[PDB]
Design a protein around this ligand. Structure first.
Ligand code: 52E
Ligand code: ADP
Ligand code: BEF
Ligand code: MG
Length: 708
């Protein structure tokens, strides 16, 4: 007499039905004994105890939100962070070190089928690896989820599994491969209120393989680096790890060399020295230097990199005042300009002139215009973000150079996506639009993949599949963001608005209301810069402040030129060289085109709590992520159809006891044997469907069968 009822504290909770009266049901909570009257439709059927901590939730007889949630909860507290959810995988961040990632465990998963061993990331990495050789098709592992859910941690475990199994211990390439993320994270990761090691970029790591299956090379593409983090940070947050590593670690000689001057003497360090618990910045600096040594970065490359990190900071120490009774920019103190110019290998007078009085061509004449304090601050800020992303791109292209040095492309690859998941913030700027546009494509991919896997399964069994593409639901929303013309999208109207002379951020929004106002996935807010978009996971209020500027990404042409002709060979290489929106759409088209031609493996990461705590599972927050992931839409769709499918030999062996009379003494066909057991059970012909190898059942039909 036990059931699942909705719970404000636990999401769902065990309770027993004491009295029924039509739709009204009076339950008694199996925790505190408190009486609760609620509707029959809020009540959720509970699974037999033989399903306690079930490794694959597709095995559940009663498929419901309450049963799935409890299955993940039971596993999580038993130390079990991995759970298979039929066609995809779920990972709940333990926030503690688990002993599941040793050399013994790697060897145990070598060539094992998904069902042959307990759930692990190693098994996803192995099944995709074996399939790549067997089927001769490219693979992908998609580690999705919120900030601090476990995307980076899992992505790296796939790398360390494959660097062991697909090795030619480890070997120069595999040793270097394991150093890519230590380097990239030093420059692209930061301490955030959500994650002490948040990825402030997204990546798709492509590992290349020999016909035999040996790692032959690798390439990494990065997306959306938060270059604005170099300038200023929110309360209790840090810039990229590298500034703290360098300042904390650098030798007495290095400090003097690169003109480094402590945590409190830099404006680009908004909160001074903020520490990362259980981590020392000086230790991490040595750990980063070591990784760059393994990757083959010469001491000169290492030192020129730290010299750029130092100049990025100095830029954010230059102070502009105003000439008396004018808006005109003045630099009364040359101290910072001199220090940064010594580092950038450029002339200080030529730099000062390039920031305060830049020469601009008008045709045919050239206007030397004096800048306002505001324009010069924007120019120095714009240049510091631009230098930093150009330093990340250089470090990245050098890592790729080290990792594809063999001039070998292989017969196949295994792509590993680790990009930022959907998150609604207080301010959702142009970057959030791009991140949320990306997830509209990654969720359409997942939805459509499940739709193909099922369409193919239903066809094999010869059972009727009356469903339209599950990916098509996310299509109008995408068309509101991309779509070049007929109704032009959000980005298309931005690109067009950036060309208008008098154009403003409000101007852009007014034009957006005028063009997309009555679009299904559009809503007017309630501020003249604000607008809403109804994404798969939820309504997001976007603020269009400085988007026109963000899409244009302007830099002072004069200083970029000086840097292009720097006396320092490295700085010169950085500045060796149309919209931000158009360029990102290209990156996403190219990534989606890649992913669409690989067999995808989904690894849905779940954050247990917003506290960064071990053994604390926030039920309603885990529920909120399964909704967002598509898990709850999945539970619904499979409830609608046939969730339980059993093979004839397994149906007979499992339920021989009940229909004892139906099976006559002798040899008989599997399909034939079951028909008679089904007929003896007097099962409704709407509840079942006989397939070519498995019997398809509606939800709770097999639960009824579960009796002794
Ligand atoms: C019946 N089924 C299950 O795995 N049921 C458990 C389950 C489904 C969904 C969310 C869940 F939590 C859970 Cl436990 C297997 C194939 O069915 C799927 O997996 N479809 C599916 C469709 C979706 C459609 C839209 C959005 C998400 C979706 C997710 N998924 C087939 C199995 O017999 C063999 O693996
Ligand atoms: N499987 C795991 N085992 C141990 N710690 C983990 C695991 N997954 C995540 N963590 C913890 O969570 C933190 C955030 O993980 P991270 O992968 O960087 O998140 P994100 O999904 O934002 O990339 C890590 O610093 C670590 O403490
Ligand atoms: F913090 Be996650 F890596 F976006
Ligand atoms: Mg990450």
């Amino acid at each position: 007499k036990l059931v699942w009822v909705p719970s404000e504290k636990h999401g769902f909770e065990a309770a027993s039905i004491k009295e029924e009266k039509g739709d009204e049901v009076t339950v008694e909570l199996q925790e505190n004994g408190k009486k609760v009257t609620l509707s029959k439709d809020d009540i959720q059927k509970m699974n037999p105890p033989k399903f306690s901590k079930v490794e694959d939730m597709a095995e559940l007889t009663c498929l419901n939100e309450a049963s799935v949630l409890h299955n993940l909860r039971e596993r999580y507290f038993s130390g079990l962070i991995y759970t298979y959810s039929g066609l995809f995988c779920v990972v709940i961040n333990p926030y503690k070190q688990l002993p599941i990632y040793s050399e013994k465990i790697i060897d145990m998963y070598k060539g094992k089928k998904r069902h042959e061993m307990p759930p692990h990331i190693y098994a996803i990495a192995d099944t995709a690896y074996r399939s790549m050789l067997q089927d001769r098709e490219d693979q992908s592992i998609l580690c999705t989820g919120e900030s601090g859910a476990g995307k980076t941690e899992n992505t790296k475990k796939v790398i360390q599994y494959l660097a062991v199994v697909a090795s030619s211990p480890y070997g120069e390439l595999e040793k270097q491969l394991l150093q890519a993320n230590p380097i990239l994270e030093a420059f692209g990761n930061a301490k955030t209120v959500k994650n002490d090691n948040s990825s402030r970029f997204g990546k798709f790591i492509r590992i290349n393989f020999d016909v035999t299956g040996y790692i032959v090379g690798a390439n990494i593409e990065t997306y959306l680096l938060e270059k604005s983090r170099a300038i200023r940070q929110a309360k209790d947050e840090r810039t990229f790890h590298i500034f703290y590593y360098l300042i904390a670690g650098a030798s007495e000689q290095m400090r003097n060399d690169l003109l480094l001057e402590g945590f409190n003497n830099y404006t680009f360090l908004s909160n001074g020295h903020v520490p990362i618990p259980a981590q020392q910045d000086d230790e991490m600096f040595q750990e980063t230097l070591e990784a760059m040594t393994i990757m083959g970065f010469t001491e000169e490359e290492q030192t020129s990199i730290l010299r750029v990190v130092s100049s990025v900071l100095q830029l954010g120490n230059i102070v502009f005042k105003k000439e008396r009774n004018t808006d005109q920019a003045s630099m009364p103190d040359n101290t910072a300009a001199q220090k940064v110019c010594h580092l950038m290998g450029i002339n200080v007078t030529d730099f000062t002139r390039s920031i305060l009085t830049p020469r601009i061509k008008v045709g045919r004449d050239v206007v030397q215009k004096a800048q306002t304090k505001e324009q010069a601050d924007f120019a120095i800020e714009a240049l510091a973000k631009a230098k930093f992303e150009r330093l990340f791109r250089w470090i990245l292209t050098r890592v790729n150079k080290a990792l594809d040095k063999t001039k070998r492309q292989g017969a196949s690859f295994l792509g590993i996506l680790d990009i930022a998941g959907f998150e609604i913030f207080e301010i959702n700027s142009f970057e959030q639009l791009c991140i949320n546009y990306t997830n509209e494509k990654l969720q359409q991919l997942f939805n459509h993949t499940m739709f193909i896997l099922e369409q193919e399964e239903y066809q094999r069994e010869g059972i009727e599949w009356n469903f339209i593409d599950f990916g098509l639901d996310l299509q109008p929303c995408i068309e509101l963001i991309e779509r070049p013309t007929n109704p032009p999208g959000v980005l298309a109207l931005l690109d067009e608005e950036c060309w208008f002379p008098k154009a403003t951020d409000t101007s852009f929004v007014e034009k957006l209301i005028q063009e997309q106002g009555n679009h299904a996935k559009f809503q007017k807010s309630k501020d003249k810069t604000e607008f809403c978009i109804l994404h798969y996971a939820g309504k997001v209020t976007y603020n269009a402040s400085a988007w026109l500027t963000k899409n244009m990404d302007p830099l002072n042409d004069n200083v970029t030129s000086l840097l292009n002709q720097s006396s320092d060979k490295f700085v010169a290489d950085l500045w060796k060289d149309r919209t931000v929106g158009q360029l990102y759409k290209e990156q996403l088209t190219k990534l989606m085109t890649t992913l669409r031609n690989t067999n995808p493996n989904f690894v849905r990461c779940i954050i247990p709590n917003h506290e960064k705590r071990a053994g604390k599972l926030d039920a309603h927050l885990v529920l909120e992520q399964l909704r967002c992931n598509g898990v709850l839409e999945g539970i619904r769709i499979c409830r609608q159809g046939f969730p339980n499918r059993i093979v004839f030999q397994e149906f007979r062996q499992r339920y021989e006891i009940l229909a004892a009379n139906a099976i006559p003494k002798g040899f008989m066909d599997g399909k034939q044997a079951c028909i008679l057991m089904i007929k003896a059970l007097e099962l409704d012909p709407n509840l079942y469907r006989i397939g070519q190898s498995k019997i398809f059942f509606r939800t709770g039909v097999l639960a009824h069968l579960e009796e002794e």
